[PDB]
A paper describes a structure:
We determined the previously unknown structure of the isolated F-BAR domain of PSTPIP1. To better understand the molecular basis of the physiological function of PSTPIP1 in the immune system, and its role in autoinflammatory diseases, we elucidated the 3D structure of the F-BAR domain (residues 1–289) using X-ray crystallography. Initially, we solved the structure of the G258A mutant, and subsequently that of the wild type protein. The two structures were almost identical. After superimposition, the root mean square deviation (rmsd) between all the equivalent Cα atoms was 0.275 Ǻ, which was similar to the estimated errors of the coordinates of the structures (0.23–0.24 Ǻ). The asymmetric unit of the crystal contains two molecules of PSTPIP1 that form the characteristic elongated crescent-shape of F-BAR dimers. The concave side of the F-BAR dimer is overall electropositive and contains two clusters of basic residues in each protomer, one in the core region, and the other near the tip of the wing. On the other hand, the central area of the convex surface has strong electronegative character due to the presence of multiple acidic residues. Large acidic surfaces are observed in the F-BAR domains of other proteins, such as Cdc15, growth arrest-specific 7 (GAS7), and formin-binding protein 17 (FBP17), but are absent in several F-BAR domains. The residues of PSTPIP1 critical for binding to PEST phosphatases (see above) are located in this electronegative area, supporting the notion that the acidic convex area is important for PSTPIP1 function. Finally, the conformation of the PSTPIP1 residues involved in LYP binding is very similar in the free and bound structures.
Residue numbers in the entry:
A (entry chain B): 4 to 289
B (entry chain A): 5 to 289
Write the structure that this text describes.
């Protein structure tokens, strides 16, 4: 039980603080989406540099002087290092795609937000404009009523024993002043009528904008929460990929027998199984 | 299946068996260096990677967010630094393994040089006395040929030659036979001196082979173990990071979209009633 429409009004007729607070929340939401975008961007750059560095270490690493099992195990470690480095380079492209998804979502909400801003700014400007005119008409109407009352009181004063020419002067003046009070009343009634029509338009627009702004925040909170859940899974998935790649190094080490490598080197590089015969004395005549 | 019984040479002057084994130790030393450089470069990569993760976490924003989504974002920032700090610790772990192999490699070089000096000394003496024995054989056989030419010259003229000439050639043949006998003793002694050194070389060669085989058994064991430990430490880093990333998902489970919307409304609400319309006010009422 909480809605933007029912909870962002203002008793002050000339105040639009409710709309301003909601519009500020959207601006704060836009900044939050940018901060999520920048974190993915920098993280992708960290993954790319890290992935490329792992690949370079694997390619340029040595081990050519080793043979048999230990050579295969070392070549297996180099091979899996390149696989991890390439996988982290692939992760950088994945994060940059998530960055592009939020990037176009942020601009899509800005386009729809600007449309509501133009409507509200127009109707609020007109509401305050006609309210100012109605108060100016109200002041004139109340001044004309005072003029009409004082003009009639002046006529009744001199109508008692005043001269006929003087009495007729105040009577025609009071009639002219009383008509001006009627005309000022019609203009004041018209100003109130014009203000009422715009006020009902503003209240309908404000309720419409509140429902729309709440939908924009519900969508933004949902997609940002989803972005964090997907980002955490993609990073956790990278740990599982790497652990499986490092498992291939351990699988190669399982077939690494120290005694087998020693026997393999002996059989391949053996020179002789018999020591040289001693040099004996040779008689020249026998 | 032993180094001693399988690295001899029928050629008396050949020590190829020892040279092949020493070449294998040099190839093993280079392999240990290559394992050292792989750990060094990997440690440098982990440190650079870890430090960058920390910097991204510290400098990341999100200050405009509130309630659950802010806490979830702060959880990712906090765990990113935890992962980055853990990778810096991994670099120090790999550098200690690098230092462990480095001191094993230098301890084997010191012991190898000691066996190299012993074998080089006895092999140099073995070839030296063999050369002297062959030089003595050449002189002994040359003195025998001189004795043969001295006896044939006497026997040629001993038939009908003059008494003075026959007695002259007889004394020459007697002196040539004496030189062959004296040269024979020098040749016999050279063979005797060479034989004692040869038996010493055979005992040294067998001892050095067992030592070189023990050095290879130690090197293969520590290098195979180093690969096994290195793979486990990298796999341990994947498990640590997954546990740190698990804290981000645990924070997201308590992230309710409706709760954050309600929290903003309760905190920033301005009014529940729209403003009353402006009515016509009669000056006389």
């Amino acid at each position: 039980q909480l809605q933007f429409k029912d909870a962002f009004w203002c008793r002050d007729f000339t105040a639009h603080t409710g709309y301003e607070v909601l519009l500020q929340r959207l601006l704060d939401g836009r900044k939050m989406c940018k901060d999520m975008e920048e974190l993915l961007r920098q993280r992708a750059q960290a993954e790319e540099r890290y992935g490329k560095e792992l690949v370079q270490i694997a390619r340029k690493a040595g081990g050519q002087t080793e043979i048999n099992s230990l050579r295969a195990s070392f070549d297996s470690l180099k091979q899996q290092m390149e696989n991890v480095g390439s996988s982290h380079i692939q992760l950088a492209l994945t994060l940059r795609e998530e960055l592009r998804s939020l990037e176009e979502f942020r601009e899509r909400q800005k386009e729809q937000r600007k449309k509501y801003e133009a409507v509200m700014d127009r109707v609020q400007k007109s509401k305050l404009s006609l309210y100012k005119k109605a108060m100016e008409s109200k002041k004139t109407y109340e001044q004309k009523c005072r003029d009409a009352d004082d003009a009639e009181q002046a006529f009744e004063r001199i109508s008692a024993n005043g001269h006929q020419k003087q009495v007729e002067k105040s009577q025609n003046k009071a009639r002219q002043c009383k008509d001006s009070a009627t005309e000022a009343e019609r203009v004041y009634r018209q100003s109130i009528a014009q203000l009422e029509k715009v006020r009902a338009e503003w209240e309908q627009e404000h309720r419409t904008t509140c429902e729309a702004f709440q939908l924009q925040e519900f969508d933004r909170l949902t997609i940002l929460r989803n972005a964090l859940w997907v980002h955490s899974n993609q990073l956790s998935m990278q740990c599982v990929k790497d652990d499986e790649l490092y498992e291939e190094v351990r699988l190669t080490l399982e077939g690494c027998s120290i005694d087998a490598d020693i026997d393999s080197f002996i059989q391949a590089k053996s020179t002789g199984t018999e020591p040289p015969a001693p040099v004996p004395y040779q008689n020249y005549y026998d």
